[PDB]
Design a protein around this ligand. Structure first.
Ligand SMILES: [Mg+2]
Ligand SMILES: [Mg+2]
Lengths: 102, 71, 144, 127, 182, 152, 72, 66
RNA sequence: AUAGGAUAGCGCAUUCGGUCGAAUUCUUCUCUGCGGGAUUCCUUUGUAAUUGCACAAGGUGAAAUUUUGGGCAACAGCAGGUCUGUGAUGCUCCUCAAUGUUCUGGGCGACACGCGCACUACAAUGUCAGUGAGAACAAGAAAACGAACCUACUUGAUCAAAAGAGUGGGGAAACCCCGGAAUCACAUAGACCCACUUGGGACCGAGGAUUGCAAUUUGGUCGCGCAACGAGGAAUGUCUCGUAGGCGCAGCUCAUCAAACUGUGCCGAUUACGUCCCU
């Protein structure tokens, strides 16, 4: 009837996968309807800068990339059950957001 | 340029010495044995080791090879 | 009544992806992006699209309705993807609704005429590198 | 056009004291007169009501001056002001379309005015 | 229900044979509906010999910055050129093209003083296409004749071994110089 | 033979026939009917500011209206920005590199207004322009006439 | 030397187009203009008119290239 | 005018820039002809391989061995 | 058809992202964290071997040789650049009409010239004017309730463009977006017809918009084109397959302003598959 979305975002692929697996395991233990863990497209932030600090020599460039991993989990559970599912140790560098879908 | 680096050659020779009755003339079964009998961070090296182990076994069938001593 | 016979295939050339749906029907028609083959322009690309049909023959595509949705790439890549999708959809339909004595003969003719009719082209754009105007060409060098 | 050359066809036509080639089409030969471009020539042809596929030597003198006076007074023929080159004269404030030697005369007068005023563009043109 | 391909659905490839024994294995006569057949012909060394000859002409027409990468333009120009050749010769334009390619390149030229050497069969096919397309392109630069016609007379003249063709004129002077320093 | 039905097929719809044939037939039908509204500014203004010359075709407004009708048929709920993207062109900027320029939305607005006046198209819910009942019927009937080769 | 090409059909050139241009094995606007010392535009117009009168038949056609030949 | 020959063996690439290819050619002549199975050494420019065909023009000259 | 060719169809006729239709099922495409897959693996009465290490063809395959493009990269150097990145600094110099700091006006863009690198040209495999079909990479709003940012759609519109309004949406796989890119196509029965010309836009005139504190910036409109330039001497760059070349698009700097760069897709060749002549 009422559906709630968990959004897990991180820079660390291993950390976000571990948190998503932990949330899935908790949801399965709680026996709630789960609309799968959806892997949203990974987003790459790219910045290219000159390698030199002075402008001398061959114009060599440096490319830095930062990857963003996002997962969403849809479940039918009230606020107390969702809070009990989400309350555990978590990991650093990842964040989980609660939303209510209408 | 498909020469087997000394790391690959030494690992394959050690594999042949340690497991000889457990190997075969094909590449895929040898590689399947290699995955269990060796620990490595890479799969390209495992494939190369399996290929050179198959080559070593084919040579060993015809005659003894230098660097490998079967007790 | 009668069971629906559906087969979906895909053909890729560069970025272009063409999804072809093949269904049994009373009257055979083939439309690429909602456009009939005769209405497809230019005659250069329409010839390439019809190459999928004429290699094996019209009797195999008879009573078969095929629609193609192509997305990405330019006109030439879309045409190649569409023809590959049509050829792969024919072979797939025969594989699912006919014996293997045939279908293999159709595959033989397709492969003999053109490998790319049934097998996707692996070529893709090479990335651009700094200090180079393109993938290969380098910045102009001056001495005096 | 598949039309025979008229007996009055002339290769060089005099329009607003300028020579115009009769081989070229009407607008592409009306663009020869200074003050008239491609767009202005096409609009002049439309206002005169003559076919743009005709040659410039086949037109008669009864419409030659008609074209010339259209060019002289375009605003009279409901040609919009924004289509004219001189929309607001900095001296007189009127709207007109200079043509033939008038554009050169007005340019020389503008340069002389800037020179006398002693502006940056006066001295830049003087350089 | 299958039928043998015909170029532009008009010209048949049946009976396409090189006029002479030379370049027999290097002039391809495989039937194809249209010149544009995208493939990796440059991956191997002699794989370009298997390319259909009309496609090779279309590729040769793809020169200069204005004409680089325009293969549909080349296909259309060849479509008109084959019609013009058929009108001029009352003969199969594919056969005329094969004959022109067969006799449009020198069989001997000098190299480094300079010593005369033979020409490989692969290069003769390449140079025949290169000279014929180059001869038409410069011919159709600033004259009233359009490109499909300028390419038509070049192929017709080359097929008859006439000195009016740019490829034949280059062939005569190149072989003449080769014999001079032979 | 060219007119005859292929077999087991009846009638015709839009996008089943030649786009240029349909557009020219629709423009000719509009000109013969004469109920369309032609702005006086169409005889002077250009189709887009990216272009450097006048349209030079007397029936250019009718052709543009027919093309806009076909575009509304193909993409329901499309607006003047989408039509400008459809009818854009590459503008010559002089010695500077050429860049794509979207068509001026004024002519598209005028063509859409003329189509609503004719009743062929109407504003849709939550923005955009959509085809009407008679617009869809007229498009399909003209598409059938195109392969009939009546051509007005 | 700059060629001089007429922009309109003359009395003699028109009947020369109507009579001499047919029975040509290959007919194109460029070569017709070359023969008659006329412009390619009016040459193409006259060739289209001849096709309308069915004196010559159009074999190869395109938005920019037209090829004609004699009627057999 | 132009007698044909088959490429039997491809020798090394003669030349400082490696553009010419020394090669062995067997003349293609009918049985009983004086040039039947006549083997000659010749220099060829362009991409050449074994079992290729080459019109020799004049077959009197023999390429100097490299 | 205008003169109207060619180019598949022969239980059940096609269509209709606004018909904003309902219902049901599923994952062909798509998304993506871990997997796999290629190893000379297989085959030559190949080469070589005369142990080997290998190699060349063909096979198998999505891919067949460092699979491909990157990144990383030893050990010595260089009086190479940077004391204009830094609260990196030693030694010096200025230090209150200051070598500090602010503010105002001007310069950094001034020309006869020489040179590097770009961009646009010299037209017809073209230029205008129509129609058609069609990518990818991306970016979006704010401190010590929303408002700035990006957008669609409408209107202006009872009448050019450029504007200007209004109304929504998007914190971005959600809006833009079904991303209508330009190369390209067109049997468009379109104009031109070999000329410095409707090729080419240098350069300048008059109006109006818009950015901005400031325009003595930037669009848009009408003139100018009669500015060279018709393919470039001696010279000399880069490049081997989705490559060169052609064509756009995005990000970036950024109030405003890309002939730049960093990416990205589109269309797509010639040649070589060698060699040590040159360097
Ligand atoms: Mg120093
Ligand atoms: Mg810069």
């Amino acid at each position: 009837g009422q559906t709630v979305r968990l959004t897990i975002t991180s820079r660390n692929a291993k950390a976000v996968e571990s948190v998503t697996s932990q949330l899935l395991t908790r949801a399965r233990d709680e026996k709630v309807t789960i609309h799968g863990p959806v892997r949203l497209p990974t987003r790459t932030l790219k910045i290219t800068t000159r390698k030199t600090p002075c402008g001398n020599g061959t114009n060599t460039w440096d490319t830095f990339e930062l990857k963003i991993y996002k997962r969403i989990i849809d479940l039918h559970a009230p606020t107390e059950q969702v809070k009990k599912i989400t309350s555990f140790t978590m990991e650093s560098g990842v964040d989980v957001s609660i939303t209510i879908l209408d | 340029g498909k020469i087997r680096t000394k790391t690959v050659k030494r690992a394959s020779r050690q594999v042949v010495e340690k497991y000889y009755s457990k190997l075969n003339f094909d590449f895929y079964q040898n590689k399947r044995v290699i995955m269990d009998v060796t620990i490595a961070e890479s799969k390209k090296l495992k494939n190369k080791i399996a290929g050179y182990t198959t080559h070593i076994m084919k040579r060993l069938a015809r005659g003894p090879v230098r660097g490998i001593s079967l007790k | 009544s009668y069971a629906l016979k559906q087969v979906q295939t895909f053909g890729k050339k560069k970025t272009a992806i063409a999804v072809a749906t093949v269904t049994k029907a009373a009257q055979c028609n083939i439309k690429v992006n909602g456009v009939p083959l005769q209405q497809i322009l230019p005659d250069t690309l329409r010839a390439k699209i019809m190459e999928a049909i004429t290699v094996v023959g019209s009797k195999y595509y008879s009573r078969l309705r095929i629609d193609v949705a192509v997305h990405g790439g330019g006109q030439v890549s879309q045409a190649y993807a569409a023809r590959q999708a049509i050829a792969k959809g024919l072979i797939a339909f025969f594989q699912k609704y006919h014996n293997e004595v045939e279908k293999a003969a159709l595959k033989d003719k397709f492969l003999a005429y053109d490998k790319f009719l049934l097998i996707a082209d692996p070529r893709r754009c090479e990335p651009k590198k700094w200090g180079r105007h393109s993938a290969r060409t380098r910045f102009t060098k001056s001495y005096r | 056009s598949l039309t025979l050359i008229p007996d009055h066809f002339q290769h060089i036509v005099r329009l607003l004291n300028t020579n115009v080639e009769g081989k070229r089409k009407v607008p592409f030969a009306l663009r020869m007169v200074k003050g008239v471009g491609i767009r202005f020539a096409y609009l002049v042809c439309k206002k005169a009501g003559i076919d743009v596929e005709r040659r410039a030597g086949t037109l008669t003198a009864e419409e030659l001056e008609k074209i010339a006076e259209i060019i002289a007074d375009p605003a009279k023929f409901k040609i919009p002001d924004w289509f004219l080159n001189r929309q607001r004269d900095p001296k007189t404030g009127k709207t007109e379309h200079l043509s033939s030697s008038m554009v050169d005369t007005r340019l020389r007068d503008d340069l002389e005015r800037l020179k006398k005023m002693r502006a940056h563009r006066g001295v830049r043109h003087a350089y | 229900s299958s039928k043998t391909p015909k170029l532009f659905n008009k010209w048949s490839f049946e009976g396409l044979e090189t006029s002479e024994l030379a370049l027999r294995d290097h002039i391809s006569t495989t039937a194809a509906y249209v010149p544009h057949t995208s493939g990796r012909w440059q991956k191997r060394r002699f794989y370009k010999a298997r390319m259909p000859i009309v496609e090779r002409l279309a590729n040769g027409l793809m020169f200069k910055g204005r004409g680089n990468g325009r293969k549909l333009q080349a296909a259309r120009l060849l479509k008109h050129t084959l019609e013009i050749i058929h009108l001029l010769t009352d003969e199969n334009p594919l056969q005329v093209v094969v004959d022109a390619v067969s006799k449009g390149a020198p069989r001997e030229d000098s190299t480094r003083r300079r010593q005369a050497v033979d020409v490989s069969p692969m290069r003769r096919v390449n140079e025949a296409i290169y000279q014929m397309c180059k001869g038409a392109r410069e011919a159709a630069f600033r004259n009233l004749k359009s490109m499909p016609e300028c390419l038509a007379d070049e192929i017709v003249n080359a097929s008859k071994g006439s000195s009016n063709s740019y490829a034949i004129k280059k062939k005569d002077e190149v072989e003449r110089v080769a014999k001079a320093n032979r | 033979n060219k007119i005859h039905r292929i077999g087991k097929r009846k009638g015709a719809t839009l996008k089943d026939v030649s786009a240029w044939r349909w557009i020219k037939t629709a423009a000719r039908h509009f000109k013969q009917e004469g109920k369309i509204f032609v702005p006086n500014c169409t005889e002077i203004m250009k189709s887009s500011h990216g272009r450097e010359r006048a349209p030079q075709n007397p029936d250019w407004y009718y052709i543009r209206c027919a093309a806009v009708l076909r575009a509304i048929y193909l993409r329901p709920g499309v607006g003047y920005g989408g039509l400008s993207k459809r009818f854009g062109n590459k503008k010559n900027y002089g010695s500077r590199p050429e860049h794509t320029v979207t068509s001026s939305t004024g002519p598209l607005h005028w063509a859409c207004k003329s189509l609503t006046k004719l009743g062929l198209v109407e504003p849709g819910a939550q923005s955009g322009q959509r085809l009407t009942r008679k617009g869809h019927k007229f498009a399909d009937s003209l598409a059938f006439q195109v392969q009939i080769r009546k051509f007005g | 030397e700059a060629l001089q090409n007429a922009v309109m059909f003359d009395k003699e050139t028109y009947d020369k187009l109507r009579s001499e241009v047919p029975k040509y094995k290959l007919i194109t606007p460029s070569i017709i203009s070359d023969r008659l010392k006329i412009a390619v535009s009016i040459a193409a117009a006259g060739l289209k008119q001849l096709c309308r009168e069915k004196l010559i038949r159009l074999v190869s056609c395109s938005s920019k290239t037209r090829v004609y030949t004699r009627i057999v | 005018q132009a007698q044909v020959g088959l490429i039997i063996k491809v020798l090394g690439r003669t030349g400082s820039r490696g553009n010419v290819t020394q090669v062995r050619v067997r003349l293609m002549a009918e049985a009983g002809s004086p040039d039947y199975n006549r083997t000659i050494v010749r220099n060829v420019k362009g991409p050449c391989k074994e079992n290729d065909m080459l019109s020799l023009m004049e077959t009197e000259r023999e390429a100097r061995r490299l």
